[PDB]
Amino acid sequence: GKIIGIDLGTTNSCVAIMDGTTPRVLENAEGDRTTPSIIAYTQDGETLVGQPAKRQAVTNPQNTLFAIKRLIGRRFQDEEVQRDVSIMPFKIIAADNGDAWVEVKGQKMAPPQISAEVLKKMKKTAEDYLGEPVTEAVITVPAYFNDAQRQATKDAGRIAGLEVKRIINEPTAAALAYGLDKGTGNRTIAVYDLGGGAFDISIIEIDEVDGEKTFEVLATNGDTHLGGEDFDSRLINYLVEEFKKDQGIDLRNDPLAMQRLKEAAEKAKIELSSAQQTDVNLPYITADATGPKHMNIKVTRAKLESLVEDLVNRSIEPLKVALQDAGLSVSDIDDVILVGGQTRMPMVQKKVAEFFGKEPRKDVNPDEAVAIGAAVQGGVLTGDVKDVLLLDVTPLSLGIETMGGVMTTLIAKNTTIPTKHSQVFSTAEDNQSAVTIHVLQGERKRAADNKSLGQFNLDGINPAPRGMPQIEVTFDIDADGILHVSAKDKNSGKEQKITIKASSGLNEDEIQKMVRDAEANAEADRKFEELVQTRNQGDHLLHSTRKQVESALTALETALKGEDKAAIEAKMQELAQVSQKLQQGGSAQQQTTGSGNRLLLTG
Numbered sequence: 071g072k073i074i075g076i077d078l079g080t081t082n083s084c085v086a087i088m089d090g091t092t093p094r095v096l097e098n099a100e101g102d103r104t105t106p107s108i109i110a111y112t113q114d115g116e117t118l119v120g121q122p123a124k125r126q127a128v129t130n131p132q133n134t135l136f137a138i139k140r141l142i143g144r145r146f147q148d149e150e151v152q153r154d155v156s157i158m159p160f161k162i163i164a165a166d167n168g169d170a171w172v173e174v175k176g177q178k179m180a181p182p183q184i185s186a187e188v189l190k191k192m193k194k195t196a197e198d199y200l201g202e203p204v205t206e207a208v209i210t211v212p213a214y215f216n217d218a219q220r221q222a223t224k225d226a227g228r229i230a231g232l233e234v235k236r237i238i239n240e241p242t243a244a245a246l247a248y249g250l251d252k253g254t255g256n257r258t259i260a261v262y263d264l265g266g267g268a269f270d271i272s273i274i275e276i277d278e279v280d281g282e283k284t285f286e287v288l289a290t291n292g293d294t295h296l297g298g299e300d301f302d303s304r305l306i307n308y309l310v311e312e313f314k315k316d317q318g319i320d321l322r323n324d325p326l327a328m329q330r331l332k333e334a335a336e337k338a339k340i341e342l343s344s345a346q347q348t349d350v351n352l353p354y355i356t357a358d359a360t361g362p363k364h365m366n367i368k369v370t371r372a373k374l375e376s377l378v379e380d381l382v383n384r385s386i387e388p389l390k391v392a393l394q395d396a397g398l399s400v401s402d403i404d405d406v407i408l409v410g411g412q413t414r415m416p417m418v419q420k421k422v423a424e425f426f427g428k429e430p431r432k433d434v435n436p437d438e439a440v441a442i443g444a445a446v447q448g449g450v451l452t453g454d455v456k457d458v459l460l461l462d463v464t465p466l467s468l469g470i471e472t473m474g475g476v477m478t479t480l481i482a483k484n485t486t487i488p489t490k491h492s493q494v495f496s497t498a499e500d501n502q503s504a505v506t507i508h509v510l511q512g513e514r515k516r517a518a519d520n521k522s523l524g525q526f527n528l529d530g531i532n533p534a535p536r537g538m539p540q541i542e543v544t545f546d547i548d549a550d551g552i553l554h555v556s557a558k559d560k561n562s563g564k565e566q567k568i569t570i571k572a573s574s575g576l577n578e579d580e581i582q583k584m585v586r587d588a589e590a591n592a593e594a595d596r597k598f599e600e601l602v603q604t605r606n607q608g609d610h611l612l613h614s615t616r617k618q619v620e621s622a623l624t625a626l627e628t629a630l631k632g633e634d635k636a637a638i639e640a641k642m643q644e645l646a647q648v649s650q651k652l653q654q655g656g657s658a659q660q661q662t663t664g665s666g667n668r669l670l671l672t673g
């Protein structure tokens with residue numbers, strides 16, 4: 071069968087499919103190209119999904135679940151979930167394992183069983199159009215999702231009876247929808263995604279060589295707490311302050327009124343993106359001892375812009391960081407893509423256009439670009455789309471320099487991404503206070519034959535003998551392919567870190583050379599590791615005795631570089647007889663000859 075693309079949003083979901091060569095966004099059973107991400111369980115035992123559920127949320131607040139993406143994959147005691155516990159009108163509870171679950175009519179349900187209801191409708195939407203079963207899907211997630219959030223989204227898919235063939239970040243999906251059928255030429259794009267639940271920004275390179283289009287992320291970030299929800303709650307606060315001032319009542323203590331007020335405020339926000347003024351009209355919004363009370367408040371676009379301007383101006387500073395991290399100026403960005411329903415606000419479009427100096431592209435639909443890109447990825451997996459290349463694996467092994475100029479691999483070539491691997495190293499010399507984490511890319515055993523991706527220092531290590539300190543080095547490649555290298559001194563807690571650009575990378579011409587070069591040199595590289603491993607067990611023991619005095623000692627400095635194992639192993643036996651004939655509050659003594667298997671770092 072077909073592999074469908076689903077944009078699984080906080081607020082809205084969308085299903086798309088490849089129709090031979092062109093993607094088509096599908097209308098649900100109600101004639102809508104998007105479906106609200108809302109699931110409701112009614113008193114008479116039915117499960118409503120989408121617009122039918124949205125329409126009755128205000129009359130059935132306890133049993134209508136929405137914004138489950140804020141909970142899926144999170145622990146119940148996370149502060150973000152606890153803040154969420156108070157404000158949401160449905161019951162959020164701790165599962166037996168501490169996960170954040172929800173409770174409806176006495177049934178405890180996991181967030182993925184709830185999101186699966188939207189996916190069952192998305193699967194059904196596609197099956198009605200195609201006339202055959204659907205079982206495979208590509209589903210999108212925000213770029214800030216961690217490992218657990220990604221697992222939970224896949225889990226939701228399995229419960230909906232869909233096999234989730236691939237997960238791809240939402241900004242990457244948006245670039246794929248735009249990158250089919252693009253006006254030819256290499257372009258740099260900025261994807262500005264402001265949805266109901268979060269802001270995410272990406273800098274994405276779309277290149278073209280021999281008819282094949284490749285997609286590479288140069289930087290990505292955002293703000294996980296700016297979204298259409300936060301625009302609403304600025305308007306909500308204004309209406310509360312205006313009503314308190316006009317009628318002396320604070321609505322915040324009237325749950326029935328606040329549910330009505332949040333929906334009225336959101337529809338007003340939306341309406342003011344198209345009109346210059348609007349009226350919020352809520353009869354019987356509350357009551358006190360003197361009878362019913364009624365709200366009728368005028369909100370102009372100028373007033374609205376005043377309430378939320380601060381949120382938009384704070385979204386600009388994350389773009390500058392993305393440019394710093396991509397090493398680019400605004401002037402190198404050739405196109406801007408607006409994604410997300412909240413970007414339809416004119417102040418947002420104007421404010422973004424002002425930063426980049428160019429008008430955002432008008433042929434990318436902000437509610438649909440992500441789902442279409444998800445459909446594109448599905449078509450690549452079936453082979454139906456061929457001018458698309460997404461690299462989901464490391465092209466080359468990645469590692470660090472360890473004592474003796476050796477490349478030590480932390481993540482092997484062709485490992486599926488995202489992935490994360492750590493290993494603990496130590497210091498190479500007595501009383502060494504710092505180590506230089508030297509990051510390398512390539513297949514050779516000599517560090518000097520590989521590509522340097524960058525380096526950094528970690529300081530503050532206590533004077534101690536070699537091999538006694540513990541330095542944890544972690545390589546993390548995120549799903550969008552960006553490499554984060556960190557180093558941590560485990561006994562003190564100190565940490566230093568770097569991010570490594572794609573530009574400091576190696577190209578396909580160069581990747582194929584590194585692979586061809588290494589196989590031809592397999593025995594020679596093995597020989598270098600062998601004469602290193604012994605060279606360094608030997609300079610192991612003259613550092614150990616120059617410090618012990620405080621002699622063929624200049625003759626073993628010679629016979630370390632003389633590339634022979636038994637040549638150093640003789641200058642071992644030679645100063646092993648120039649030596650064989652003639653406990654306080656700090657580190658510990660030797661007293662025996664054992665050493666440890668932990669690899670060593672220069673610094």
Ligand SMILES: Nc1ncnc2c1ncn2[C@@H]1O[C@H](COP(=O)(O)OP(=O)(O)OP(=O)(O)O)[C@@H](O)[C@H]1O
Pocket residue numbers: 078079080081082083107139264265266267268297298299336339340341343409410411412413414415436437
């Ligand atoms: N016409 C509009 N003008 C301005 N804002 C709008 C408009 N239409 C939708 N919004 C706002 O956009 C938000 C929904 O955006 P969207 O449907 O793209 O979010 P989503 O993809 O579900 O969210 P997320 O990307 O975090 O998962 C809503 O909170 C809504 O208030």
Ligand SMILES: [Mg+2]
Pocket residue numbers: 079080240265266410440
């Ligand atoms: Mg979205």
